[PDB]
Symmetry: C6
Subunit: 323 residues, 6 copies
Amino acid sequence: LSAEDKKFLEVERALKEAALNPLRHATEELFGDFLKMENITEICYNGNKVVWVLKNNGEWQPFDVRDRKAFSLSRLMHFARCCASFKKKTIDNYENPILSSNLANGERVQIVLSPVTVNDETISISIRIPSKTTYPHSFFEEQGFYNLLDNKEQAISAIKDGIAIGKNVIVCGGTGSGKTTYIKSIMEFIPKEERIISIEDTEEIVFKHHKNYTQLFFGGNITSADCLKSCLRMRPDRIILGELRSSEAYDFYNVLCSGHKGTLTTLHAGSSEEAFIRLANMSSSNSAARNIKFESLIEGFKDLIDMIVHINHHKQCDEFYIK
Amino acid sequence: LSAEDKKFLEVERALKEAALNPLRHATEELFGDFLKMENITEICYNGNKVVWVLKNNGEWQPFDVRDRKAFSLSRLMHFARCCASFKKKTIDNYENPILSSNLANGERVQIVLSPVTVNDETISISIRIPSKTTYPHSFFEEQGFYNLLDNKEQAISAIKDGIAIGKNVIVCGGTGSGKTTYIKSIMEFIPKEERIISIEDTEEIVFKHHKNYTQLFFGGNITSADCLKSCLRMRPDRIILGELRSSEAYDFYNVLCSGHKGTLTTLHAGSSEEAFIRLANMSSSNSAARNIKFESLIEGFKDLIDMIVHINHHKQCDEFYIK
Amino acid sequence: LSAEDKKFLEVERALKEAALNPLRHATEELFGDFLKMENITEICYNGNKVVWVLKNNGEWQPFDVRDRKAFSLSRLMHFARCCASFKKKTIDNYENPILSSNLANGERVQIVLSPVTVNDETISISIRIPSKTTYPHSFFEEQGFYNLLDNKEQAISAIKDGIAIGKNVIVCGGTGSGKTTYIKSIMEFIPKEERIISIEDTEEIVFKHHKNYTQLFFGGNITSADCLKSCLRMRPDRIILGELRSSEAYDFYNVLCSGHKGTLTTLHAGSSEEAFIRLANMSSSNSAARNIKFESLIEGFKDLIDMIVHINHHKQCDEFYIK
Amino acid sequence: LSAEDKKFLEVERALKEAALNPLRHATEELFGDFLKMENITEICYNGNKVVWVLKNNGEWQPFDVRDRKAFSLSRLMHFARCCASFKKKTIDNYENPILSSNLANGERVQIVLSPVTVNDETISISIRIPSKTTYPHSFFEEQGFYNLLDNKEQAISAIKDGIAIGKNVIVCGGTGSGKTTYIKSIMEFIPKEERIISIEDTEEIVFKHHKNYTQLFFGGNITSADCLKSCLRMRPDRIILGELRSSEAYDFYNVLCSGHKGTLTTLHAGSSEEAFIRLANMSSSNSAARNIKFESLIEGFKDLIDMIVHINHHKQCDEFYIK
Amino acid sequence: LSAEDKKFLEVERALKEAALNPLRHATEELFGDFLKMENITEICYNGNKVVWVLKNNGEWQPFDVRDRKAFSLSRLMHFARCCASFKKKTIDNYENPILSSNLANGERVQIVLSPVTVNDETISISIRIPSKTTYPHSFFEEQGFYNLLDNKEQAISAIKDGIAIGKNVIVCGGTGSGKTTYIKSIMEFIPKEERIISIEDTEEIVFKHHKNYTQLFFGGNITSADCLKSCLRMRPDRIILGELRSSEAYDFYNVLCSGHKGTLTTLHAGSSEEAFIRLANMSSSNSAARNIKFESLIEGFKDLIDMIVHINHHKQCDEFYIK
Amino acid sequence: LSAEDKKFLEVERALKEAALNPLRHATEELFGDFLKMENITEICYNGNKVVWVLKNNGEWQPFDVRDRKAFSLSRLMHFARCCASFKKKTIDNYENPILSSNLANGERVQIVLSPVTVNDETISISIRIPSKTTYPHSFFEEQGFYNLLDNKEQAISAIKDGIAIGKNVIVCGGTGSGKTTYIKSIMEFIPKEERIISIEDTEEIVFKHHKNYTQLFFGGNITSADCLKSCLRMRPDRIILGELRSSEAYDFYNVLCSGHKGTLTTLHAGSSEEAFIRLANMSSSNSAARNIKFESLIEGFKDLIDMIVHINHHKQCDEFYIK
């Protein structure tokens, strides 16, 4: 079939692989070395001939690029447009100076040009490194992910059993607190017979223990609400939400109202109590929740969310909400 | 008359059976074997050369299709387009990657293409088997559909008598908990003299004990609200709502406000208390309920819904709400 | 004048009588026999070669039409279009499968075609028989319309005197509970010197005891709100509302706020308490009531409605609300 | 100046007196006799060869016109169109069957044509006689306008003094309760030095005791809100509102909020308490009051309206609200 | 520079001075004599050959103009159009019968034509005389502006000191209660070093004691909200609002929320308590205050407004609100 | 690279330096001398041949320019247009008399022309001097910035430690109270390893102690909400908001809800308590907060804002809110 399938794809690939090849070389030429460094969480460039790299250990390391052709306005701009076209977008110095796109491999890329930047020789770039690895849950314990908890044993058992029985779990914290990583590891506890549908922004979750599943990705005209709506039409046993933004916000509250099996998602929030308000706020912004009391949404999630895990800047659990 | 009627239909049938014949062969060529398997509730394909079939016993069974022409991008895409055109829709890799359509027989079909799927060799397909069969209510008892209830005898009598007297009943639970099946069986108790109008999404309910009736189907530009609106203009004794979504939501609250005879419908909800909120939420989203207090809607259904039956993942009643 | 008036009308009549003659024959050809049967409340056809007729005694009687040219897709469709054009509408298998129109004499007609019906050989038709007769109020007593009441004498006097003094009365119940019939009879008690304006959907009320009056009919672009608005500009002593739908809903609350003489209308509602909420709900849907508290509307009608009469499925009063 | 002014007006008058002369003859030809009858409050025609005339004594008197050319469809329609064009409007059997216009002298006219009327030989007409006369206030007392009050002397003094000091008074009751008449008479008490601006729908108020004043009339594109807005820019001492409808409703609440001198207007309402709600309801419908608590409006008028006079169907005061 | 500046202005002046010269002569020809009369607050013409002039002493004086060419429809109309064009507007007998414009010197002018007036020989005109004089504050005391107060000394000191320290003061009352005049006089107490920006409708305030300042005028497409928005970008020490209308209403509440130095403005209101509600009402009408509780606005101004001065029809303070 | 980068920029620079060179000379010709004066906070021109300059010591100093070509309508207008085009805007005497732009160096400029100004020889100009200097925090103490506090030592330690630990701080006060200056100095306490993103209106903050950072500027079509949205996608450790206006208002409440590290921004407000309401008001105006209770927002910031510093007109802290 590979022979018949190749000719069939031939036309779309040429199309895609015409904006993707260019982008790969730009990517290679500029951030190549950087993308190969182990244990890094973000590659920033501040349009000042210096590349700042953030390590998993929360340290910022700078690198001198004053002497590289790759970091020339012409070279940087070409890279920028390559990202734009790749995601069917435009970046310029007028109506589109700020950009959000991805690399060939899918890593989030945020580019900012003049006039939004201080001057015309400034081109801000921020690459988000998904930290491609799937550490086992045991590894989290061995490293004391739960050491700050007073209910350590309880928490470690609740996460194992809870998830195994299909409770709705929410993992929250700040950008880069290892939220995704954590959920990826705790998935070892979903019975391998479960069908799982994952809705993400960029491929990140890996299915090491499950065969039956499907991954959905929102982006462009396809909102996350579309993927979660499709999801509910694909007979899922577990639904894994890459991250609650605002669109799905309310359509997630509903999925929960209909008493749905095992949900699991990440959210930016400083705490448990916060997570509930974060949810209400978000859900409220939806036109469908235009006639529902605000406190009524908060109490809504309060009944539906079985357990919340918060993670601090030190990639350690500092609160384990239950029941 | 059949002779005159044939020539009369001739032109629409040619039109329809021009998108339906193509679709039948595609359907036959790919999921034929699968659609013939007994006691299955869903046929999923995850674009990975393996067909996953869900059995009534809640088990997932996979099937190797690596060696079939039918499962080639070209073969799969043709099938996909066949579903699209059949329901007057389009499926593509741009503005219409997600699709909701039906088979020749009416079974719900959910197709997802790239870019929404992980890659371009992935084509997600989910067929919903309306488990074709009409088991007698007695069969439900023999199998202990009510065994978890503490008010078993009470419940089994309430459902028989209640329905016979025209109470408004709501059957709820998760996808595939046998809600439809249950309502089809409990219909044995509606006096055969009753005129029944059924509003569904796909033909599913069967009228084994009733002669005078009519089936309405919403889809496309015809919303369910249109069918329920027409319904109230067709002198019905009993109204059977395939499933409360959101459109009818409020227009259902009203049908109840006007003190209407015997209503009976299914709804996704984890419990009794939940069902009332599920209802309010939904009704609220309607512009007509823009000036009605939210708690006022909840109390609204609370007075109008005489009895609620909830079903767990094990296709067993685990709560029988009454009065 | 009849001579000059004839030539004057000549042009509109030809126009109307060009869609009305066709419709009369279709009507005659199909439901002729049926429309001549005494004491029937609805003529239904379920696209199955059988005509179901509902008798005043709540019984459904079926009739075999397998052997009639009139009931051929071609014959049924022609009838359907005749109804459509008659009311300046279209009925088809695409954007207009559901239809609401009337017969030459004005009886409500609801037609449903494929795709909304189960198949293409199904054409649903529901004719509503106004039950053309004006029984005296005494006849209602002789038949025990009030026998279920504990306050029988009280109720029978309240309706007589109340109406005679101009109180606002609301008659409610389900479709075909003899609401219209009832109001028609209790009109014997409005002083014959009263000027009455009636706003209906189809001519039904008869003025046996009153000379000075005028009938308004809404339909098409003319909403009932338009007729009630005109009404208040025609110096009426009594206003008879065919039936509260939703448009007039709020503009009716107002007519009452301005302390208006004798109002009398029908409404679908299961009870007294219900009728008040039914009213609030409806009024609320109006943009003019966008800034008025929902409970404030309920209390609104509670002060204004002097007496409510409810009728059960057995065409008997089972609640007589007063003061 | 009359010579120069004539040539100046010549062009508009020709324009106006081209639709007004035709209308005068029609008016003369049909309702001539009727318009000359003394003490009548409304001339109704129900499209049945009979003209119904309402006398000031609340009696309905009918007149046989079967034998008059004037009452022929052709003759009636010409009259109808004459009213339409006169007010720059259209009346027809399609998009404009209902009409609201005026006669040459300004009397309100309500015409209804088929399809809104029962048949095509029916043409409903309702003329409102502004009972042309300005009876002295003393005459009201002599006739016992206040005889039903327990606080007779109090009330009669309050109305005299109150109005003389500039209190905000509201006269309310049903159509034809002599509200306008009453206000016209109580104007004898406004110091003759007061500048008065009157906002009406049709000229009706007469200034027997005042020289400095101006009359504003709303109609067509000029809403009453425009006339009250202009009013507040014409240095008025007293403002007389023909009748509170809904536009001015809120813009009237404001005029009062700014603590304005002497206001006086009529409103349809059954009582005092009702009048306040009638006001709130109306004010609320204005976009400017979109963010104001409903009960807050009621309390608003409650502080601002110093005294309310209600009149029953018998043209007698049956409630005199004060302070 | 005057030489270079003249040529530069030459083109705009010709443009303006082409609609302004015509208007001056019309103004001169008609209301000349009248505009020269001392101590008058308004010049009204009621289209009846009589000019009514209001004196500062609250007296209305009429003047016979039957024998003047100036008061001929042709002469009056020309004047009317002159005002219209001057402010870039149109006045006619159709879509623009009501007019608001100004004279060459800026005095407010309100013109009303037929159909809004009673007949075609009626042309209503109302000129508002700013009363061009700047009496000292002491003069107010000598005349007993504060004599009705029980806290006389207190009030007279509070106004002096308060204003000197930059408190937010609101002067309110009815049209022509000498509000503007009052504020103009109390400005003697703002330290001469203060920079003041004044936002008015027409030039009226005079800066007798201040050198550093700027005057803003709203009108036409430039709303007062625009001038107050610009104001906050011109480093003002004191802001003087000609008069709170509704646009600035909320944008004024905000200026106060940001704890702004010395504000001072006039508002139409009957009292202190009223002034706060007047403010809330107005602010609420702004889209920006769409999500803020109504009582929350009232309490808003209650904290921010340090002192309110009300003036009665007798140009005397009858309430001095403080703290 | 400078060689390749030059040719690359060549085309945009020519474009920009074509509106910027003209503007520099105008700026030089008129306000040159003035812009060179030390310790000044605003340069105002009131279209009266006198330039008013505000000194840091709160004193207003005027300067005679009657004898300068630069201050001639032609000379002033050319300057004005130069500012307009520079920011891609238009300034005229019709639809764009008010202008907000910047100088070559970025200083805020507010220009007002006739008709908005009193006459045609008036051209209002207000330049805001960003007092260019970065005084050390110690300098603030030496000058008694905290001397009015009863909790002096506490406050001075709280600001040092608080900021060092990443608390959310809000600095508020009136225009020119040295808010920006203060925040610039207290930045010495953010660990030099912290990545900082600053969102301003004009470049003002200076990074004396930090290497890794990026500056974002909103203006034109790029709102501040866009820069804060981009900000959260650039892995910041600290976010410095030039000033809360209204757009970011709610999108700032959210950034805080997600428990974000170290925020620090300025806001116009008279006090602590005020600052919370100022925040709520602003956030509410956002469509996303349309369904959130107003008091719920106030309580929102109350939990999230760790410490608020208010500054009086005398550039001294007069309230130090904490916890």
